[PDB]
Amino acid sequence: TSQVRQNYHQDSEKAINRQIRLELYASYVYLSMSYYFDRDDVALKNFAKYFLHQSHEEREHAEKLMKLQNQRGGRIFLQDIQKPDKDDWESGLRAMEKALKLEKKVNQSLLELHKLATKKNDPHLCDFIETHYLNEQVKAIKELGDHVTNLRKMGAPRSGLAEYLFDKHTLG
Amino acid sequence: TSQVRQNYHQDSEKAINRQIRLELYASYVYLSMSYYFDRDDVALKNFAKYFLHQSHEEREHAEKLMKLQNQRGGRIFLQDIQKPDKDDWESGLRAMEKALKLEKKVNQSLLELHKLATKKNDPHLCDFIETHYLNEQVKAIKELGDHVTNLRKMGAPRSGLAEYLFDKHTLG
Amino acid sequence: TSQVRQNYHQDSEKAINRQIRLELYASYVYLSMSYYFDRDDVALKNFAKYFLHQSHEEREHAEKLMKLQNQRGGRIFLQDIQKPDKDDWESGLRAMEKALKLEKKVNQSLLELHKLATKKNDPHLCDFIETHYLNEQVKAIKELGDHVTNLRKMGAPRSGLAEYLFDKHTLG
Amino acid sequence: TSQVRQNYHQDSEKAINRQIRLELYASYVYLSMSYYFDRDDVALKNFAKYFLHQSHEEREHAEKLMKLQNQRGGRIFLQDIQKPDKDDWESGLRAMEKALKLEKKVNQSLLELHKLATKKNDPHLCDFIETHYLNEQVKAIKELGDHVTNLRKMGAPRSGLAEYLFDKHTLG
Amino acid sequence: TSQVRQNYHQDSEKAINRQIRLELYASYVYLSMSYYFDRDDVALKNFAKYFLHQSHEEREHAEKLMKLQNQRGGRIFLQDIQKPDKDDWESGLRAMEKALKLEKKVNQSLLELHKLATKKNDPHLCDFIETHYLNEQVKAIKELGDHVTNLRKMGAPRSGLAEYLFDKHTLG
Amino acid sequence: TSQVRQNYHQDSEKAINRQIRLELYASYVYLSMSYYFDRDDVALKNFAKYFLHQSHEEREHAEKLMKLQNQRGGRIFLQDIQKPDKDDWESGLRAMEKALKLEKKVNQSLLELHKLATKKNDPHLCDFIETHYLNEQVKAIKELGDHVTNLRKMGAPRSGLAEYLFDKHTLG
Ligand SMILES: [Cl-]
Ligand SMILES: [Fe+3]
Ligand SMILES: [Fe+3]
Ligand SMILES: [Fe+3]
Ligand SMILES: [Fe+3]
Ligand SMILES: [Fe+3]
Ligand SMILES: [Fe+3]
Ligand SMILES: [Mg+2]
Ligand SMILES: [Zn+2]
């Protein structure tokens, strides 16, 4: 038991370790999405940059939870990171729809984490989660929703023209 | 029979002269393509600029091979340069398709040149081809392929709208 | 078969995908190392920073390989990234010794990759591995080696004083 | 018939296509000459630079005629470019002498082309020729005459010292 | 066996020790030549500066090979450096001629060393040789060839004026 | 038999040639020492830099004596340069001890040279030795002696900690 550990429940500790794994997973998925758009047969540069940026942000959220684990005197245990569910993400619109689903999954996880911390009367952990994660997730979700909407409204994915113009006028 | 010549095989010297002619021919193809886009009945300014830039770069590659030839104590023998295959390149997509085929043809020659140099045990030449030619070719081919992909996905060569917006948003 | 693909063997494609996974695994080991030194009961900030920088460098090497795979017309196929071999890296010296061993494993894989590219007569791919990977590995292996020696000579991992002073004067 | 075409005779259009071929040929002659002076057994760097400059100028003159052909609604038809007359240009003076002869052949062609424009009452074309070509020709011919004179009175071609010194003081 | 050693053949290690000796010898030859031109009865200051520069470059090439030997886990064994072949280098042209011969002997040694690296499948070593040595050699040999040519056509060595003027206009 | 020669005795001329060889040898010793510190199993960067700097300075002293030789109308006669006494210099303390011995040896030679110059009534030479060599030697010897003293007092060569902290706080 760490010399710094105080009011930090073993269930919170384990759940932080589960959240680190999920973030690393989200990072990997966004990486895969990014380089799908860099394919010579997809060729959507700003989709590629957009996803690569989300991949780097998810990694940073992982690192920030590992930092938190050590700050509170928990112990980091890393697990296998599963490969993403697809190799070929099919289109700009389908990839955005999948990212929206993925972010809502990560949000559901973060909401269960905040609820756990609440039940364990861990206001530090609660505030950490609210300040650094919950509003970032709401914002990402809103932006992905907006992007899905525009693409659909523009005629994706049957219009490859819509995907191209979207890449240029929104993502660029 | 040059004072500077060393480990430079006569078959290498001749391959280099053939390459110089090929780079010059490619330069001429891109010249023709460029001024097809400058026609009043085609009128795609950024297609014209793009292909003119490629024309200038091919000529640079040719000059740099002439420079290599003398650096090694080879002798330059210049040949007739054949006119391009078409006078009318039909469309932006079809010009890009042709460029891509041409670049792969040039790359094929450069690969065959590297292999000769490797059989003749000429590492200076290998490296020169590697450093200046092979990565440039791979980048040119990927770029062309990306441009073809976008043009097809946008609805070319059906859509004259596709070619126009591509000219503006990708090539400008 | 991708329209940009040329002189790019299916074996090379497969090997580039294995190398991507190895680099991602290496990134994850250094990630683990970093946050081990951030523990309140280890508390060597510059060992932590040092390892976190190697984790980000490894990720960037994975990403540059993904880019090359697309550049050449191959297709990325990502796999599960296994967790690192340890949770607890014991000491500054033992993490360095493990890291030397990891880099030497990655270097072996890259040399096998180069030998394959050579056997497939892929000089573009040979030169990309030479230019972007092999000298970097040799630099990294040399530096890790230096660091292992210095810690040994100072009396690590026996001397916690030696790990602390090395953290300040070399890694700071 | 192009929608832009006005007061542009078919013979004029044909004559511009010939002049384009000749300017590209003149470019290639100067390119040959430039790299003759770059040889290790000739080694006059300022002669090389001077003829390479000429070569690039001549290409620019050709591209400007291509621009004109499109401006007026004519159609460009490119032809084979024949290799120059010599592989070996023999000395500084001899190359200057051959360039002067070349330049006066280009000029005669241009005066023939201006005569034709006058016969077809194409003032635009006459003025384009005047303003962009005839006075550049007259200047180039005088410059070349001046150079040939200086090399002669310096004792070229029986003086390699004469050619070296002119390389340095006039061409450098 | 060094803890850094990997894929580095004993013969390679031995060949690098020989190349180090030869580069130091080439340094000393150019040092001798430099101060020959500093004598009151020769007095060509730009030849002196030129050969002193060469001397320092050759020392740098030797130090870089020493750096390499350590990078790869090899061990440096230094040998006697034999005095150069002449005390008196006779004229500007003759010294340039001997330097060219020297440089082509260094180059042959380097190509022999690159052959060996290839036979031992050491791509790192091959690339180090290519990137730091073979193209510097090829450049130095061309430069020297150019100089010897100019001095010859200027009437050296039967013209002390020729050597003085080249000192000033080429080497100054 | 130089036009510039005046009050310059043949015994002075020969002593100067011997000194030049000694400065060159010393330069080589410091080279060897420097790259011993650059070994992965020694790994003392500021020791390596220090001894490389001394190597460069000895070579400068040698060049300056070559310059003196010609200034006086002497003739330079270069000799073989012997390899250093050791390949392995064992430790920072032991290398410093050896440097100190070497510097005293060189100083001995320079003192004997000054005394000859004084017997030959050559005040220009006396002063040259005094101004450029003797105070530099005395400073080098004092510095080396200070470095040895610190290293012994810190606990070298027992303590690998001593050598490390000295590298950082004195030589960095
Ligand atoms: Cl638009
Ligand atoms: Fe997240
Ligand atoms: Fe090219
Ligand atoms: Fe890596
Ligand atoms: Fe012209
Ligand atoms: Fe060298
Ligand atoms: Fe000295
Ligand atoms: Mg290479
Ligand atoms: Zn727009």
Coordinates of C-alpha atoms and ligand atoms in Angstrom, one line a residue, chain A residues 19 22-23 26 30 54 57-59 61-62 65 103 106-107 110 132-133 136-137, ligand 2:
Chain A
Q19 CA -10.2 2.8 -18.8
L22 CA -10.1 1.3 -23.7
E23 CA -8.4 4.6 -24.5
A26 CA -9.8 3.9 -29.2
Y30 CA -8.4 5.9 -35.0
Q54 CA -8.1 11.8 -32.7
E57 CA -5.7 12.7 -28.5
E58 CA -6.8 9.3 -27.3
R59 CA -3.3 8.3 -26.5
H61 CA -6.0 10.6 -22.5
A62 CA -4.5 7.2 -21.8
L65 CA -5.1 8.3 -16.7
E103 CA -16.9 7.6 -28.7
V106 CA -15.9 5.3 -24.4
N107 CA -18.2 7.9 -22.9
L110 CA -16.3 7.1 -18.4
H132 CA -10.5 16.3 -18.2
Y133 CA -12.8 13.8 -19.8
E136 CA -14.1 16.6 -24.1
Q137 CA -16.2 13.5 -24.8
Ligands
FE2 FE -10.8 9.5 -24.8

